[PDB]
Amino acid sequence: IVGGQECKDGECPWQALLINEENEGFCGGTILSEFYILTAAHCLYQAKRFKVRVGDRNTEQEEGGEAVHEVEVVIKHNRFTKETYDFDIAVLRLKTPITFRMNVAPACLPERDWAESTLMTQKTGIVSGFGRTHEKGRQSTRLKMLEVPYVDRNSCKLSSSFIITQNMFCAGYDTKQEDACQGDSGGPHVTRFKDTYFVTGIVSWGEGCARKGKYGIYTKVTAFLKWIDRSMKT
Amino acid sequence: LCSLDNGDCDQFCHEEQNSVVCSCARGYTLADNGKACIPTGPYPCGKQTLE
Numbered sequence: 001i002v003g004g005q006e007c008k009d010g011e012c013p014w015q016a017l018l019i020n021e022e023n024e025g026f027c028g029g030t031i032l033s034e035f036y037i038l039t040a041a042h043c044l045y046q047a048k049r050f051k052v053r054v055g056d057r058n059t060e061q062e063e064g065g066e067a068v069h070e071v072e073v074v075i076k077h078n079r080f081t082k083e084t085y086d087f088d089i090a091v092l093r094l095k096t097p098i099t100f101r102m103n104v105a106p107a108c109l110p111e112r113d114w115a116e117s118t119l120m121t122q123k124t125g126i127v128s129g130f131g132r133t134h135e136k137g138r139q140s141t142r143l144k145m146l147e148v149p150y151v152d153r154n155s156c157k158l159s160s161s162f163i164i165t166q167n168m169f170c171a172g173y174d175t176k177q178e179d180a181c182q183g184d185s186g187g188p189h190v191t192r193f194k195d196t197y198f199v200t201g202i203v204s205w206g207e208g209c210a211r212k213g214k215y216g217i218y219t220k221v222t223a224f225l226k227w228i229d230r231s232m233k234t
Numbered sequence: 235l236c237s238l239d240n241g242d243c244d245q246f247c248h249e250e251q252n253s254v255v256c257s258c259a260r261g262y263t264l265a266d267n268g269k270a271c272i273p274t275g276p277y278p279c280g281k282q283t284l285e
């Protein structure tokens with residue numbers, strides 16, 4: 001996350017962190033329930049083997065609320081393509097259930113129509129993660145969150161060098177220096193409604209980070225709600 | 235209806251028979267007034283944790 005703020009205690013409880021064999025975080029995830037984590041399919045090409053960590057806010061020190069979970073099943077979207085970044089979604093079934101507690105809780109899955117009419121219509125959504133805090137910098141040590149404005153689909157399409165498919169949407173700023181960045185991929189984009197947070201996107205990609213005239217690109221969760229439901233039923 | 239202040243629903247709003255019908259995410263149950271959503275246990279989805 002470039003710009004934005006540190007997630008304060010209890011503020012981003014649905015944040016999951018995928019970690020590699022060397023225990024380093026390489027991508028984000030969103031807790032959907034005790035057994036399922038939502039992440040980006042492209043993250044799965046990033047590590048030989050990986051585990052999921054929940055409840056972590058500072059990778060510099062075990063605080064007590066953290067918990068590592070091994071993955072039992074990786075359900076990647078059949079139609080995902082590394083070439084266009086289309087269908088950038090994957091569901092992880094954990095071997096053991098997550099125990100909810102302070103800093104560990106699921107984000108709600110909305111219904112498609114209501115989500116499209118009322119959530120993606122909101123002024124902003126919230127993205128969060130342990131990724132880079134500058135386009136060329138190193139991974140963040142502290143979990144951060146950033147409020148990102150929903151971006152008109154047409155200006156979004158015009159701003160991008162690559163095709164914005166119907167499975168993607170835009171958020172962020174034209175010139176202001178704030179945006180998700182490398183390491184945040186697979187992480188949560190949620191929208192608040194009457195103090196309840198609903199999952200609306202998955203951190204996907206962008207051209208550099210926080211670049212002038214460019215926005216952050218997110219997988220459009222509302223387009224895979226049936227696919228998610230199926231993935232969690234198995 | 236649902237375009238007027240989300241139909242007074244706490245969460246999901248659907249316009250059926252020209253009438254507003256409210257509903258809730260998993261882990262919540264529709265209140266007696268048929269509009270509010272009541273968490274069914276601790277750590278309901280979408281709530282920031284206070285303890």
Ligand SMILES: Nc1nccc2ccc(CN3CC[C@H](NS(=O)(=O)c4cc5ncccc5s4)C3=O)cc12
Pocket residue numbers: 083084085162179180181182183184185203204205206207208209210216217
């Ligand atoms: N902003 C960000 N926000 C969120 C997550 C991000 C993850 C990685 C990077 C880092 N990355 C990943 C690749 C991208 N480089 S590009 O602009 O050449 C692109 C080439 C291309 N070809 C086909 C489809 C799309 C593209 S984008 C970049 O900057 C930037 C991110």
Ligand SMILES: [Ca+2]
Pocket residue numbers: 056057058059060061062063066
């Ligand atoms: Ca820690």
